[PDB]
Write a protein that binds this ligand. Structure first.
Ligand SMILES: *[C@@H]1O[C@H](CO)[C@@H](O[C@@H]2O[C@H](CO)[C@@H](O[C@@H]3O[C@H](CO[C@H]4O[C@H](CO[C@H]5O[C@H](CO)[C@@H](O)[C@H](O)[C@@H]5O[C@H]5O[C@H](CO)[C@@H](O)[C@H](O)[C@@H]5O)[C@@H](O)[C@H](O[C@H]5O[C@H](CO)[C@@H](O)[C@H](O)[C@@H]5O)[C@@H]4O)[C@@H](O)[C@H](O[C@H]4O[C@H](CO)[C@@H](O)[C@H](O)[C@@H]4O[C@H]4O[C@H](CO)[C@@H](O)[C@H](O)[C@@H]4O[C@H]4O[C@H](CO)[C@@H](O)[C@H](O)[C@@H]4O)[C@@H]3O)[C@H](O)[C@H]2NC(C)=O)[C@H](O)[C@H]1NC(C)=O
Ligand SMILES: *[C@@H]1O[C@H](CO)[C@@H](O[C@@H]2O[C@H](CO)[C@@H](O[C@@H]3O[C@H](CO)[C@@H](O)[C@H](O)[C@@H]3O)[C@H](O)[C@H]2NC(C)=O)[C@H](O)[C@H]1NC(C)=O
Ligand SMILES: *[C@@H]1O[C@H](CO)[C@@H](O[C@@H]2O[C@H](CO)[C@@H](O[C@@H]3O[C@H](CO)[C@@H](O)[C@H](O)[C@@H]3O)[C@H](O)[C@H]2NC(C)=O)[C@H](O)[C@H]1NC(C)=O
Ligand SMILES: COc1ccnc2[nH]cc(C(=O)C(=O)N3CCN(C(=O)c4ccccc4)C[C@H]3C)c12
Ligand SMILES: *[C@@H]1O[C@H](CO)[C@@H](O[C@@H]2O[C@H](CO)[C@@H](O)[C@H](O)[C@H]2NC(C)=O)[C@H](O)[C@H]1NC(C)=O
Ligand SMILES: *[C@@H]1O[C@H](CO)[C@@H](O[C@@H]2O[C@H](CO)[C@@H](O)[C@H](O)[C@H]2NC(C)=O)[C@H](O)[C@H]1NC(C)=O
Ligand SMILES: *[C@@H]1O[C@H](CO)[C@@H](O)[C@H](O)[C@H]1NC(C)=O
Ligand SMILES: *[C@@H]1O[C@H](CO)[C@@H](O)[C@H](O)[C@H]1NC(C)=O
Ligand SMILES: *[C@@H]1O[C@H](CO)[C@@H](O)[C@H](O)[C@H]1NC(C)=O
Ligand SMILES: *[C@@H]1O[C@H](CO)[C@@H](O)[C@H](O)[C@H]1NC(C)=O
Ligand SMILES: *[C@@H]1O[C@H](CO)[C@@H](O)[C@H](O)[C@H]1NC(C)=O
Ligand SMILES: *[C@@H]1O[C@H](CO)[C@@H](O)[C@H](O)[C@H]1NC(C)=O
Ligand SMILES: *[C@@H]1O[C@H](CO)[C@@H](O)[C@H](O)[C@H]1NC(C)=O
Ligand SMILES: *[C@@H]1O[C@H](CO)[C@@H](O)[C@H](O)[C@H]1NC(C)=O
Ligand SMILES: *[C@@H]1O[C@H](CO)[C@@H](O)[C@H](O)[C@H]1NC(C)=O
Lengths: 211, 226, 311, 38
C-alpha cells in the first residue's frame, strides 16, 4: 500500500491520524513496524495498550461519535522511527482485512554522526582462487546517506563496485558496505587502492595496498 | 511465556506449493486464534488469514482461492500452504496469536455488536524467495586484521537471503557487526561480518567465524589470524 | 421507479433489508430537466416489482401528502365544553362500570384535559382509576365486543429510535420540497421499547383478578399475542417524537394464569413506517417527514384494548 | 443559467399564479364599520 510521511522533532509529541474514519462505533488497533522486523501491537482496544509499552503511547477512546482515531506518541525519540498502521474496525463496514496505509515517522533533530570506514584487502585464499575483492565497511553514521569512491592509485575506479543502501543499525545509526571486485592481477599491478567515503559535508579515506 | 517461531524453505520455484510452519512455546495451540501475515518489499503488511480455537478457518479474499491454513494440536504446530506462487509472493512471513475482541454498541439481544481481531504476539519471520534460480552455498574467506583492531569474515556468492553468522560458535558477542548483504549483478548475495577486539587479544585468542546458509544446508567455519 | 440497495451495516441476517437506500429520477424547479437524487426509505414503505427495483407502498391504492414539517404531532390536552343552556354531567363513582345508575354525579362546564393520543393495544398517557382496575365492555359475554381495561397504577414504558437520522430537503417543484432521509450518523441500531418486567407482571395480574369476576374464581385465563390483521392492529402502534412506531407485543401477552425478573425489563422490537394509511378510508395516505436526531419518549400505559375468543 | 438560456425569477423559491385578467387592480374606497353595540 501507499505510505504517508510524517516528521516530528526530537522530543515533541507525534499525532498520527488514522487513514480511514469510522462510520459507526469503532475498535481500532495500532501497530508499530520497522521493515525487516516483526510488528509490535501498540494499542488494541481504541485506548487499551498491552504490557511492555510505555504510557507515552496513547489512543483515543470511542466515547461520542465524531472523534477521530489518532495515535499519540509523546516525547518522541529516535527509536520511534517506524511505520505505524491503523487497523480500523467499525459497526457499519465489514471485516477489516487490510491493515490500511502506513505513516512513516521520521524524527528530526538527531545528532549528526560520522562514519567508521574500514577497508580490507583481498584474502590470500580468495587470491588463491584467482579472484580478489576489496570490502569497504561504513558504520555508525547519521544522517544515513553516504557516497563511496574507489580509486586505483590516484585514478578513479567505477567498474566492478557494488554498494549497499544504508540500513539503520540497532543503535539508530546507519551502516553501509561496498565491494570492489578486481582480478588478482589488477590487485598486484597497482600500487594502492583507496575507498573514499563522503558523508554530509566531509569525505574520509581508507587505503590498502598489497604488502 | 508464549513465543512463536516460523520455519520455511527460503526458496520455492514458481507455480509450486509454498509451505511454512510455526511452533508455539509455553502455551497450547487449540485454545487461541492464530493469523498468518506477510510483508513484501514496497508493499505494506498484508493479512493472509486466521484460524480459530475450534480450528475454523477464514481467508483474505485477496488470496482466498489458493491458501490453506491448518493446525496440528499434537505438538503446537500450525501450518500454511500457499500454492501457485509467483514472483510477487516472496516476502517475510510472520506468525501471530490473534485475540478476539467483542465490541458492543447496542443490544446484544439484537446482535448490535461486531468481532475484531488483534495479534498480540508475533514470531520473528521467515524470508521466502520465489525464483527459478537454483540455490548455492556461500564461499567464506578470512579478513585478517592488522587502541584496538578489527577482523572479519567475508561471505560471498550465495542465494537466497539470508545467512546467519556467529563468532566462536556463539561465545563472542561483544563488538560483532554483521552487515546487510549485497545483490551483485550475477544474482548472488555477498555478506560481511566484522568484530572489533582488543589488540593484545591477537596472541592467541582463536576467532572462529560460524557461517550458516540453511537453503543449501551448507554451514562452514573459518579462523582468522594475522 | 426506485432503484434501491441495502444501506450499510452487514448486520444480523435479514435485518439489513429493514432500511433501504433508494435513488430515483425526480422533477426539478424546471419542468423539463430531471435530477437523480437518493433517499433512505424504511422497508415497510416500499414493495418490489420483480431486479432491485422498488416503489412506494401507497402508489397503487392512494394519493400521498407529506405533513408540513412545522406542525407538532405532540398531543395537547383538549377540553370539551357544552353550549350555554346545556351541561356536562360527570359520574364520580370510583367503581363505575360505564353503564347504569351512577349514584354520585356532578356537573361541569367543560371536561377535563384529554390528550388526543391514538395508539393500539396499549392505551398511553391516559387517565387512571382510583380504586382497583375497571373492565368495560357493553356485552362482556359477547366475545366480539372489545374489552377496555383501565389501570389504576401507571406501568411506564420507554421507547426510542436510536439511529441519528438526517433530513435532506429535495426541490421537486417550484415551492414544493420533499424531505428525504439523508443518512445515519453513527451506528445503525434497532428501535424498541422497554417496560419494567416487574411492574408489567403485577399490573397484568390485577387485570386477571377483575377478569375473574366475569368468568369465575376457578377458570384459567390466558394472554396470547395478536391473531392477525393489518400492521397497525397487530402491534402497539403509536407516535413517538414524530415517528410512527410499530412494536411487537408478543413479549407482553405470553402468559397463562392458574386458578390461584425483579431486576431487568422486557424489550419490544418496534419497526417504523413513514407512509401511513388512513384508518377508515382508502385513497388517502400521509407521509410523515423524517425526524432528525435521536428519538426517545417516556409515557405510561394506563389501559389496554383486549379481545376474547370464546379456559 | 450560465449561453442565452433563462428561467422565470420565481422558479426556485415559489409557485406562481397569474391574476385572472378580468379583476381590476384599481383601489376602490373601503369604509370600515363597527357592529351594533360598538
Ligand atoms: C432498554 O433495555 C435495554 C436492555 O437492557 C438497554 O439496552 C442497553 O443499551 C446500552 C446503551 O444503549 C448498552 O450499553 C452498552 O454496553 C456495552 C457493553 O458493556 C458491557 O460489557 C463491557 C465489556 O465487557 C468485556 O470486558 C469486561 C472487562 O472490561 C469483562 O468483565 C467482560 O466479561 C467482557 O470481557 C470478556 O468478554 C468478551 C466477550 O464477551 C471477550 O472478548 C473478552 O476478551 C472477555 O473474555 C463491560 O465493561 C461493561 O461494564 C460496564 O457497565 C456495567 C453495567 O453493565 C457497569 O458496572 C460499569 O459502568 C462498567 O464500566 C458492560 O458489562 C458498552 O461497551 C457500551 O459502551 C461503549 O460503547 C458506547 C457506544 O458504542 C460508547 O459511547 C461508550 O463510551 C463505550 O465505549 C467505551 O468502551 C468501549 C468498549 O471497551 C471502548 O472501545 C471505547 O473506547 C470506550 O472506552 C472508554 O470507556 C470505557 C468505559 O466506558 C473504559 O473502559 C475505557 O478505558 C475508555 O475510557 C454501552 O454502554 C447495553 O449493552 C444494552 N443492553 C444489552 C442487554 O445489550 C436500553 O438501554 C434500555 N433503555 C432504553 C432503550 O431506553
Ligand atoms: C446511498 O447510496 C448513494 C448512491 O446513490 C451513496 O452516495 C455515494 O456515496 C459514496 C461513498 O461515500 C460517494 O463516494 C465518495 O465521494 C467522496 C467525495 O468525492 C470521496 O471522498 C469518497 O472517497 C467516495 O469516493 C459518492 O459520491 C456518493 N454519491 C452520491 C450521488 O451521493 C450514499 O453514500 C449511500 N448512503 C448510505 C447511507 O448508504
Ligand atoms: C406521553 O406524555 C409525555 C409527556 O406528557 C410525552 O413526552 C414528551 O415527548 C416529547 C417528544 O418525545 C418531548 O419533546 C421533546 O423534548 C426534548 C427536550 O426538550 C427535545 O429535545 C425534543 O426535540 C422534543 O421537543 C417532550 O419534552 C416530552 N415531555 C415530557 C414531559 O417528558 C410522551 O411523548 C407521551 N407519549 C406519547 C405516546 O405521546
Ligand atoms: C393516516 O391518517 C390520515 C392520513 C391522511 N389524511 C387523513 N385525514 C384524516 C386522517 C385520520 O386522522 C387518520 O386516519 N389517522 C390515522 C391514525 N392516527 C395516528 O396517529 C396513528 C397512526 C399509526 C399508528 C398509531 C397512531 C391518527 C391519524 C393520523 C388522515
Ligand atoms: C447526531 O448527528 C449530528 C450531526 O449529524 C450531531 O450534531 C453535532 O453535535 C455536536 C455536539 O457535540 C456539534 O459540535 C456538531 O457541530 C454537530 N454537527 C452537526 C453537523 O450538526 C449530533 O450531536 C448527533 N446526535 C447524537 C445524539 O449523537
Ligand atoms: C425510563 O426512563 C426513565 C428516565 O429516562 C427512568 O426513570 C429514571 O429512573 C432512575 C432510577 O434510578 C431515576 O434515578 C431517574 O430520576 C428517573 N428519571 C426520570 C426522568 O424519572 C425509568 O426507570 C425508565 N424505565 C424503563 C422501564 O426503562
Ligand atoms: C438486503 O439484505 C438481505 C439480507 O442479507 C438480502 O436478502 C437482500 O437480498 C438484500 N437486498 C438488496 C437489495 O441488496
Ligand atoms: C433516470 O433516467 C435514466 C434515463 O435517462 C435511466 O437510465 C436511469 O436509470 C434513471 N434513474 C433511476 C434511478 O432509475
Ligand atoms: C397494491 O399492491 C400491493 C403489493 O403488495 C398489494 O398487496 C395490494 O393488494 C395492492 N392494492 C390494490 C388495491 O390492488
Ligand atoms: C355494569 O355494572 C352495573 C352495575 O350495576 C351492572 O348492572 C351491569 O350489568 C354491568 N354491565 C356489564 C356489561 O357487566
Ligand atoms: C350478549 O351476547 C350473548 C351471546 O354472545 C347473547 O346471548 C346476549 O343476548 C347478549 N347480550 C345482550 C344484552 O345483547
Ligand atoms: C371469588 O373470590 C373472592 C376473594 O378473592 C370473593 O370475594 C368472591 O366472593 C368470590 N366469588 C365467587 C363467585 O366465588
Ligand atoms: C405471535 O406469536 C407466534 C409465536 O411464534 C408468532 O409466530 C406470530 O408471528 C406472532 N404474531 C405477532 C403478530 O407477533
Ligand atoms: C414478534 O416476536 C416474536 C418473538 O418475540 C416472533 O416470533 C414474531 O415473528 C414477531 N412478529 C412478527 C410479525 O415478526
Ligand atoms: C433563487 O435563485 C436566485 C438567482 O439569482 C438566487 O439569488 C436566490 O437566492 C435563489 N433562492 C433560493 C431560495 O435559493
Amino acid at each position: 500500500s501507499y505510505v504517508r510521511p510524517l516528521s516530528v522533532a526530537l522530543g515533541e509529541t507525534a499525532s498520527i491520524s488514522c487513514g480511514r474514519q469510522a462510520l459507526g462505533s469503532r475498535a481500532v488497533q495500532w501497530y508499530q513496524h520497522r521493515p525487516g522486523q516483526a510488528p509490535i501491537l501498540l494499542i488494541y482496544n481504541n485506548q487499551d495498550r498491552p504490557s511492555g509499552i510505555p504510557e507515552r503511547f496513547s489512543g483515543t477512546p470511542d466515547i461520542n461519535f465524531g472523534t477521530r482515531a489518532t495515535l499519540t506518541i509523546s516525547g518522541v525519540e529516535a527509536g520511534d522511527e517506524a511505520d505505524y498502521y491503523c487497523h480500523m474496525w467499525d459497526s457499519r463496514s465489514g471485516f477489516s482485512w487490510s491493515f490500511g496505509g502506513a505513516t512513516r515517522l521520521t524524527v528530526l533533530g538527531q545528532p549528526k554522526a560520522a562514519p567508521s570506514v574500514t577497508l580490507f584487502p583481498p584474502s590470500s585464499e580468495e587470491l588463491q582462487a584467482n579472484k580478489a575483492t576489496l570490502v569497504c565497511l561504513i558504520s555508525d553514521f547519521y544522517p544515513g546517506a553516504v557516497t563511496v569512491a574507489w580509486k586505483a592509485d590516484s585514478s578513479p575506479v567505477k567498474a566492478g563496485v557494488e554498494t549497499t543502501t544504508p540500513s539503520k543499525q540497532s543503535n539508530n545509526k546507519y551502516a553501509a558496505s561496498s565491494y570492489l571486485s578486481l582480478t588478482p592481477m589488477q590487485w598486484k599491478m597497482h600500487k594502492s587502492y583507496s575507498c573514499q567515503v563522503t558523508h554530509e559535508g566531509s569525505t574520509v579515506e581508507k587505503t590498502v595496498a598489497p604488502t | 511465556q508464549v513465543q512463536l517461531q516460523e520455519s520455511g524453505p527460503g526458496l520455492v520455484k514458481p507455480s509450486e506449493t509454498l509451505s511454512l510452519t510455526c511452533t508455539v512455546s509455553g502455551g497450547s495451540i487449540s485454545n487461541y486464534y492464530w493469523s498468518w501475515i506477510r510483508q513484501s518489499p514496497g508493499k505494506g503488511l498484508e493479512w493472509i488469514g486466521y484460524i480459530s480455537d475450534s480450528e475454523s478457518t477464514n481467508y483474505n479474499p485477496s488470496l482466498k482461492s489458493r491458501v490453506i491454513i491448518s493446525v496440528d494440536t499434537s505438538k503446537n504446530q500450525l501450518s500454511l500452504k500457499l500454492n501457485s506462487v509467483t514472483a510477487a509472493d516472496s516476502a517475510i512471513y510472520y506468525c501471530a496469536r490473534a485475540q478476539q475482541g467483542k465490541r458492543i454498541y447496542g443490544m446484544v439481544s439484537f446482535g448490535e455488536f461486531f468481532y475484531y481481531y488483534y495479534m498480540d504476539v508475533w514470531g520473528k519471520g521467515t524470508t521466502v524467495t520465489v525464483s527459478s534460480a537454483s540455490t548455492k552455498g556461500p564461499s567464506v574467506f578470512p579478513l585478517a586484521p592488522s587502541g584496538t583492531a578489527a577482523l572479519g569474515c567475508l561471505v560471498k556468492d550465495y542465494f537466497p537471503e539470508p545467512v546467519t553468522v556467529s563468532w566462536n560458535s556463539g561465545a563472542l558477542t561483544s563488538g560483532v557487526h554483521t552487515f546487510p548483504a549485497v545483490l551483485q549483478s550475477s544474482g548472488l548475495y555477498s555478506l560481511s561480518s566484522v568484530v572489533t577486539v582488543p589488540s593484545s587479544s591477537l596472541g592467541t585468542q582463536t576467532y572462529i567465524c560460524n557461517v550458516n546458509h540453511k537453503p543449501s544446508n551448507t554451514k562452514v567455519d573459518k579462523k582468522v589470524e594475522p | 421507479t426506485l432503484q434501491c440497495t441495502n444501506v450499510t451495516n452487514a448486520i444480523t441476517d435479514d435485518m439489513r433489508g429493514e432500511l433501504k437506500n433508494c435513488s430515483f429520477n425526480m422533477t426539478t424547479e424546471l419542468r423539463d430537466k430531471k435530477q437523480k437524487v437518493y433517499s433512505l426509505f424504511y422497508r415497510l414503505d416500499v414493495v418490489q416489482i420483480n431486479n432491485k427495483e422498488y416503489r412506494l407502498i401507497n402508489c397503487n391504492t392512494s394519493a400521498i401528502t407529506q405533513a408540513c414539517p412545522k406542525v407538532s404531532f405532540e398531543p395537547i390536552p383538549i377540553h370539551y365544553c357544552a353550549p350555554a343552556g346545556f351541561a356536562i354531567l360527570k359520574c364520580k363513582d370510583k367503581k363505575f362500570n360505564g353503564t347504569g345508575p351512577c349514584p354520585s354525579v356532578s356537573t361541569v362546564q367543560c371536561t377535563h384535559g384529554i390528550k388526543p393520543v391514538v395508539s393500539t393495544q396499549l392505551l398511553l398517557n391516559g387517565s387512571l382509576a382510583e380504586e382497583e382496575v375497571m373492565i368495560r365492555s357493553e356485552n362482556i359475554t359477547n366475545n366480539a365486543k372489545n374489552i377496555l381495561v383501565q389501570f389504576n397504577t401507571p406501568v411506564q414504558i420507554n421507547c426510542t429510535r436510536p439511529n441519528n437520522n438526517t433530513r435532506k430537503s429535495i426541490r421537486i417543484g417550484p415551492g414544493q420540497a420533499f424531505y428525504a432521509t439523508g443518512d445515519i450518523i453513527g451506528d445503525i441500531r434497532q428501535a424498541h421499547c422497554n417496560v419494567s418486567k416487574a411492574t408489567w407482571n403485577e399490573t397484568l395480574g390485577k387485570v386477571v383478578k377483575q377478569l375473574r369476576k366475569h368468568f369465575g374464581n376457578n377458570t384459567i385465563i390466558r394472554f396470547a399475542n395478536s391473531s392477525g390483521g393489518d400492521l397497525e392492529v397487530t402491534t402497539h402502534s403509536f407516535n413517538c417524537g414524530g415517528e410512527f412506531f410499530y412494536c411487537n407485543t408478543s413479549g407482553l401477552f405470553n402468559s397463562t394464569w392458574i386458578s390461584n425478573g425483579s431486576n431487568d425489563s422486557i424489550t419490544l422490537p418496534c419497526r417504523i413506517k413513514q407512509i401511513i394509511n388512513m384508518w377508515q378510508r382508502i385513497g388517502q395516505a400521509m407521509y410523515a417527514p423524517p425526524i432528525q436526531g435521536v428519538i426517545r419518549c417516556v409515557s405510561n400505559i394506563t389501559g389496554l384494548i383486549l379481545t376474547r375468543d370464546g379456559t
